[PDB]
């Protein structure tokens, strides 16, 4: 027998506020 | 001869009152103050 085990989610940020303002500020 | 002393006149102020450029004109903070990088930093 084998167990199956769930990992919770661990992420980090991807955006600043919903944006990425580097690329935002570039273009403006 | 009241033209030539005006002449000479000219002639002085043009090479004393000249101003800089492109050049060792080079500005202190305060002049060479980025807003958009501020405002990115403080975001």
Known sequence: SIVRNYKPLINRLKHYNGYDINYISKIG | ?43
């Open chain 2, 1 to 43: 001869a009241q033209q030539q002393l005006n002449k000479q006149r000219q002639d002085f102020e043009r090479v004393r009152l000249r101003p800089e450029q492109l050049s060792n004109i080079i500005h202190d903070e305060s002049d060479t103050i980025s807003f958009r990088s501020n405002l990115l930093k403080n975001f």
